RNA sequence: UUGUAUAU
């Protein structure tokens, strides 16, 4: 299968091989483990003349290289360092194939790279080829990265169709391992008329979402980047349940984000809840300090509590200081107390 | 190494 030239190249007969010397052999080298790398390194410091020579041989069969295990890297390099005309030509070779490349293990990488460097007109045209296949792409291991990329690179106005497709299924997608990702990208880049519906559904299912393996990340995202109004709705769902959620493998993380990003009043109230409320033997705080997950919440509470309130928290912990040593997680609270 | 998610 390999030509003499490539054959000899792999055998090291050409230690000083230059781009111009593999003329007529570009496609072959590109689909070869070492040949590809050989081309990729020459493409970054090659005269636009040498680059065109390489371009001439891959344009026609560009797609074949896009879905190639080693060839997809040569195409990516042109989208990044090639000329504007070369990027546009490759873009034309992609036309009509966006969907299949987006779901392709190697091609999805080309699509993502292309979206980053082509003009808005070519981006929009690429995006439109996904019209009608949004959920299929969002749920695909390769395709979800292309959708995320669209969301971060394309004018949010051209993404409305993705928003339309997400309406009514936000809860379902927020617990999906790829969907939770796309949803976080939508919250960071889309327009208010587009994030509003998404947020309304996230609020509707906050209770289930904070406890979900993936949904908890979506909720934490809102706490770390959302508007105060959205952050407050989330904090309101958490209050009254601090103790229980603090002991949950997934929701405990959301409790921490609430403590950290809540308003001054909200923060004081969440901490007080566990300083006042009693849990069977002793207060909620004591049970929290001995728990495998809640001990982290107590520490976050010590860190952000205001001086006056930190004092209250310390006094609550104080009496248990000697006993804490006998518990796996209590010990970790003792360590935290050291600094204080 | 006291506790959870993205790919050549």
UniProtKB/Swiss-Prot annotation:
Region annotated Guanine-nucleotide binding in RNA target, chain positions: 252-256
Domain PUM-HD: 1-340
UniProt repeat feature Pumilio, residue ranges: 21-56, 57-92, 93-128, 129-164, 165-200, 201-236, 237-272, 276-315
Location of the protein in the cell: Cytoplasm; Cytoplasm, P-body; Cytoplasmic granule
Tissue expression pattern: Expressed in brain, heart, kidney, muscle, intestine and stomach. Not expressed in cerebellum, corpus callosum, caudate nucleus, hippocampus, medulla oblongata and putamen. Expressed in all fetal tissues tested.
Region of interest: Uracil-nucleotide binding in RNA target: 72-76, 216-220, 295-299
Region annotation Adenine-nucleotide binding in RNA target: where it falls in the sequence: 36-40, 108-112, 180-184
Induction of expression: Strongly down-regulated in keratinocytes upon UVB irradiation.
Record's disease association: Spinocerebellar ataxia 47: A form of spinocerebellar ataxia, a clinically and genetically heterogeneous group of cerebellar disorders. Patients show progressive incoordination of gait and often poor coordination of hands, speech and eye movements, due to degeneration of the cerebellum with variable involvement of the brainstem and spinal cord. SCA47 is an autosomal dominant disease with a highly variable phenotype and incomplete penetrance. Clinical features include developmental disability, ataxia, and seizures.
Purpose of the protein: Sequence-specific RNA-binding protein that acts as a post-transcriptional repressor by binding the 3'-UTR of mRNA targets. Binds to an RNA consensus sequence, the Pumilio Response Element (PRE), 5'-UGUANAUA-3', that is related to the Nanos Response Element (NRE). Mediates post-transcriptional repression of transcripts via different mechanisms: acts via direct recruitment of the CCR4-POP2-NOT deadenylase leading to translational inhibition and mRNA degradation. Also mediates deadenylation-independent repression by promoting accessibility of miRNAs.
Subunit architecture: Recruits the CCR4-POP2-NOT deadenylase leading to translational inhibition and mRNA degradation. In case of viral infection, interacts with DHX58. Interacts with TRIM71 (via NHL repeats) in an RNA-dependent manner.
Domain comment, as recorded: The pumilio repeats mediate the association with RNA by packing together to form a right-handed superhelix that approximates a half donut. RNA-binding occurs on the concave side of the surface. PUM1 is composed of 8 pumilio repeats of 36 residues; each repeat binds a single nucleotide in its RNA target. Residues at positions 12 and 16 of the pumilio repeat bind each RNA base via hydrogen bonding or van der Waals contacts with the Watson-Crick edge, while the amino acid at position 13 makes a stacking interaction.
Protein name: Pumilio homolog 1
Parent-record interval covered: 828 to 1167 of 1186
């Amino acid at each position: 299968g390999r030509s003499r030239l490539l054959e000899d190249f792999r055998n090291n007969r050409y230690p000083n091989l230059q781009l111009r010397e593999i003329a007529g052999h570009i496609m072959e080298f590109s689909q070869d483990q070492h040949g590809s790398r050989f081309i990729q390194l020459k493409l970054e410091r090659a005269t636009p003349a040498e680059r065109q020579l390489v371009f001439n041989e891959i344009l026609q069969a560009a797609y074949q290289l896009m879905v190639d295990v080693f060839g997809n890297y040569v195409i990516q390099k042109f989208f990044e360092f090639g000329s504007l005309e070369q990027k546009l030509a490759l873009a034309e070779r992609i036309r009509g194939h966006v969907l299949s490349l987006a779901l392709q293990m190697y091609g999805c990488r080309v699509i993502q790279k292309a979206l980053e460097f082509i003009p808005s007109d070519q981006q929009n045209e690429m995006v439109r080829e996904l019209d009608g296949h949004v959920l299929k792409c969002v749920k695909d291991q390769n395709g979800n990265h292309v959708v995320q990329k669209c969301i971060e690179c394309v004018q949010p106005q051209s993404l409305q169709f993705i928003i339309d497709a997400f309406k009514g299924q936000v809860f379902a997608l927020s617990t999906h391992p790829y969907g939770c990702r796309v949803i976080q990208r939508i919250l960071e880049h889309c327009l208010p008329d587009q994030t509003l519906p998404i947020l309304e559904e996230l609020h509707q299912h906050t209770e289930q979402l904070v406890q979900d393996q993936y949904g908890n990340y979506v909720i934490q995202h809102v706490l770390e980047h959302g508007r105060p109004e959205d952050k407050s709705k989330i904090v309101a769902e958490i209050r009254g349940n601090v103790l229980v959620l603090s002991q949950h493998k997934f929701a405990s993380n959301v409790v921490e984000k609430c403590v950290t990003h809540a308003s001054r009043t909200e923060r004081a109230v969440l901490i007080d809840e566990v300083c006042t409320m009693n849990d069977g033997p002793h207060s909620a705080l004591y049970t929290m300090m001995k728990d495998q997950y809640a001990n982290y919440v107590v520490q976050k509470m010590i860190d952000v509590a205001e001086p006056g309130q930190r004092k209250i928290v310390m006094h609550k912990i104080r009496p248990h200081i000697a006993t804490l040593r006998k518990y796996t997680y209590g010990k970790h609270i003792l360590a935290k107390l050291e600094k204080y």
